[PDB]
Design a protein around this ligand. Structure first.
Ligand SMILES: C[S@@+](CC[C@H](N)C(=O)[O-])C[C@H]1O[C@@H](n2cnc3c(N)ncnc32)[C@H](O)[C@@H]1O
Ligand SMILES: C[S@@+](CC[C@H](N)C(=O)[O-])C[C@H]1O[C@@H](n2cnc3c(N)ncnc32)[C@H](O)[C@@H]1O
Ligand code: SF4
Ligand code: SF4
Lengths: 337, 339
C-alpha cells in the first residue's frame, strides 16, 4: 500500500497553468490509480487521456506522445524527475511506501553493526521520505551515516536507481541498502566494491550481498559471445535512455577488432523483436537492467569491453549525469524546458 | 523481385544521404542487414530499426530524425499518403508466382461471379494484375479494377484496413491471393459475392462471411454489460484516429457508459491488463480487434460495432481506414517520397 495520490494539489497545479488536456502515464502498480485520477481531473473540467504504455521510469517521459495528441501538460505517475528536456509541462508524482523502515532496521541491528561504524546508506524512491528517520535511528545506534547527493539522474540524496549508484560513491566502510529485491544491492556491491547489506522493509528480512555468482553468470554470457563475428548494438529512443554516441563507439570498436557490428534503434528493447536478424550476439546500450535481467548472448557496454580484452575488472553499466544543483521535493514537482 | 541495391544506392547518393535507417517486416530481417552492409561498403552509415514493422502506415521517419538519419528506407511495403520527416525510399515486395495458371484451372468457378467482375489482389501480386486482366477479358469477362484512395498504392490493391479498390460497379469480386482475412474483408465491406483463388495452390473458396459476423455479434453481446470502456488510439502516423476516437468517447458517455481515451503505439492487451475497463474499443488498425487469436481477455470492439452496441446501427459494417482521392499511382518498383 502507498500513500494516496494528492489529487487536489495536482489539479491546483494543472489549474495554475490552465491546462485543458492532459496525458497520464503510470507504471504497472498504478494502473487503477491512473484512471482514478483521470476521473477526478475530468470531474473538474479537464480532458484526460491515459498513456496505454507501461511506464518504467522518469527516463521515459511521454512528453512527445502528449504533444502528438495535443495535450497541454503531462502527468507522470510514480517516479520523481530526473534531468530531461520536456516538450510539455510535466507534473511528477512520486510514490511513497508507507512501511516503516525503522521497524525493519530495529529487527536487524546486529547485522548492521557487522557493516561497520561509518556506513553508507541508500534506498529507493518508495522509501526516500523515511531516509531522515533511518539516519537518525542509525546515528542513535552509534553509526556515522554517510549519504551521497548523487548526480542529475538522481532526485534526492541517497536515492539509487537500477542505472545509477552515484549516491553510494562517498566515503564509508560498508553499504546499507533499504529496499526489496537483489538487483540494486548487487549493483551497489559491484559498482563500489564494498560489502553490502540489504534489508527488505516489507519482510524485515536481510541479505548479505555476494556478487560472485552474478559475475560468474555474466562471464558465461561473455564467453558464449567470444565466438561471435556478428553483433547488433542496440539503442532506445526513450529520452533518458538514448546513448547514440556510446553505441556508435561500440560499433566502431567491434569493427576495429575484426567483428561486424550494426547499430539498432528501438523503443522498448526486447529480444523477441530481434530473432530474425542475422546477429550472433547483442550489446544493449540503454537501460542497463535489460541485459542484466534471450536465446543469444546480450551484453552491456562494459561487458563488451571485457569481451574485447580492453577491460579486466567487471563493471556494472551505469548511466551517469553531471552535477545536480538542487533536490526534488518530497512531493509532487512540475518541470518544463 | 530483387532488392535493387544499386537503384537504392543511387537514390541515396542523389539526395546527399549519409546516414540512413532501414525498417523491415518480419520476413525481410536478413535482407535488411544485407542491404545495410552494401550501403556501408559505399560510405553510407546505416542503422536498422529494431521494431517489427507491420505496414507503410507505420513509417519510422520520426525515429530516423531522432538519431540524425537524413533518409529512411522502408522495406517490403509501398507508399501510402502520409507526411514524412525524412526522404523515404519504399521498396515493395513482389511475389514471382504467375497467377494466370490458377485462374484458368478455376475458370468455371470464376464464371459464377457473372459477366462483369471486380478483380483484386494484394501488393505482392499487384504486378500480375495486368496479366490476370488480359486473360479474363480474353475468356469473355469484363474486368473492372478500382483505383482506390490515398492509402492504396496501385489500382486493384487491397489492404487489411482498406477495400476501396472494390467499391466499383460489378456483379461479384474475384480476389487473387492467399489467406482468409482479405477475402473476408471484401465480403463484409462490399456485401458482394467474393471468390478467392490461391495462386500457389490453385485452390478456390467462395467466401461466406457468416461465421465471422456471428463471432463479432458474440463480442458485442459480451460488451452489453460493460460500464467502463477504454477507447484506444495508436500514434502510428497512418493509424492515429484521434477525432474518431474522441467521438466514440463522447458517444459512450452520451449513452451512460464511462469512456476513457487510451494512447498507445503498439496495441495489445497485456499493457492494459491492470486497468479497470470492462471492454475496449480500438480506433486504429482494424486488424487488431478483428484478427485477435485470443490475446484479448476482455471484449474488444471496432468503432462500428460500438454504434451497434449503443443501438445506433442496424447492420454490421466493416471498420475501414479510408484515405482521400489519389491523384497518381505508385511505381512498380522503388519509390522515393519527401513532404
Ligand atoms: C521496472 S524499471 C525499475 C524501476 C526504477 N526505474 C529503478 O530504478 O529501479 C526497470 C525494468 O524495466 C524494464 N525496462 C526498462 N527499460 C526498458 C527498455 N528500454 N526496454 C524494455 N524494457 C525496459 C526492464 O525489464 C527493467 O528490468
Ligand atoms: C501484417 S499487418 C498488415 C499488412 C498489410 N498492411 C495489409 O494490409 O495486409 C497485419 C497484423 O498486424 C497487426 N497490427 C497492425 N497494427 C498494429 C498495431 N498498431 N499494434 C499491434 N499490432 C498491429 C494486426 O494484429 C494484424 O493482424
Ligand atoms: S534507465 Fe532503467 S533502471 Fe534507470 S530509471 Fe530508466 S528503467 Fe529505471
Ligand atoms: S491493415 Fe493495419 S497494419 Fe495493414 S496497412 Fe492497414 S493499419 Fe497498417
Amino acid at each position: 500500500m502507498l500513500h494516496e495520490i494528492p489529487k487536489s494539489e495536482i489539479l491546483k497545479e494543472l489549474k495554475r497553468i490552465g491546462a485543458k488536456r492532459v496525458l497520464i502515464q503510470s507504471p504497472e502498480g498504478l494502473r487503477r490509480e491512473a484512471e482514478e485520477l483521470a476521473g477526478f481531473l475530468e470531474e473538474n473540467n479537464i480532458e484526460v487521456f491515459l498513456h496505454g504504455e507501461i511506464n518504467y521510469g522518469a527516463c521515459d517521459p511521454a512528453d512527445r506522445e502528449a504533444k502528438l495528441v495535443g495535450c497541454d501538460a503531462l502527468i507522470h505517475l510514480g517516479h520523481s524527475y530526473m534531468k530531461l528536456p520536456l516538450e510539455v509541462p510535466t507534473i511528477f508524482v512520486p510514490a511513497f511506501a508507507r512501511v516503516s523502515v525503522v521497524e525493519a532496521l530495529k529487527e536487524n541491528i546486529g547485522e548492521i553493526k557487522k557493516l561497520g561504524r561509518k556506513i553508507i546508506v541508500t534506498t529507493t524512491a518508495q522509501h526516500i521520505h523515511q531516509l531522515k528517520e533511518a539516519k537518525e535511528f542509525l546515528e542513535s545506534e552509534g553509526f556515522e551515516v554517510s549519504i551521497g547527493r548523487g548526480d542529475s539522474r538522481i532526485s534526492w540524496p541517497g536515492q539509487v536507481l537500477g542505472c545509477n549508484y552515484s549516491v553510494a560513491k562517498v566515503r564509508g566502510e560498508g553499504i546499507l541498502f533499504i529496499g526489496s529485491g537483489i538487483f540494486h544491492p548487487l549493483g551497489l556491491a559491484v559498482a563500489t566494491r564494498k560489502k553490502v547489506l540489504a534489508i527488505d522493509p516489507y519482510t524485515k528480512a536481510f541479505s548479505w550481498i555476494d556478487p560472485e555468482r552474478f559475475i560468474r553468470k555474466r562471464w558465461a554470457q561473455i564467453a558464449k559471445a567470444m565466438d561471435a563475428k556478428k553483433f547488433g548494438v542496440i539503442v532506445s529512443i526513450k529520452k533518458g535512455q538514448l546513448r547514440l554516441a556510446e553505441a556508435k563507439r561500440i560499433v566502431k570498436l567491434l569493427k576495429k577488432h575484426g567483428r561486424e557490428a550494426r547499430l539498432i534503434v528501438m523503443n522498448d528493447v526486447n529480444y523477441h523483436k530481434l530473432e530474425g536478424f542475422p546477429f550472433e550476439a547483442y550489446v544493449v546500450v540503454a537501460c542497463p537492467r535489460v541485459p542484466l535481467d534471450w536465446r543469444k548472448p546480450v551484453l552491456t557496454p562494459k561487458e563488451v569491453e571485457i569481451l574485447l580484452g580492453l577491460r579486466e575488472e567487471y563493471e556494472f553499466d551505469e548511466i551517469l549525469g553531471g552535477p545536480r544543483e538542487s533536490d526534488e521535493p518530497f512531493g509532487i514537482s512540475i518541470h518544463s524546458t
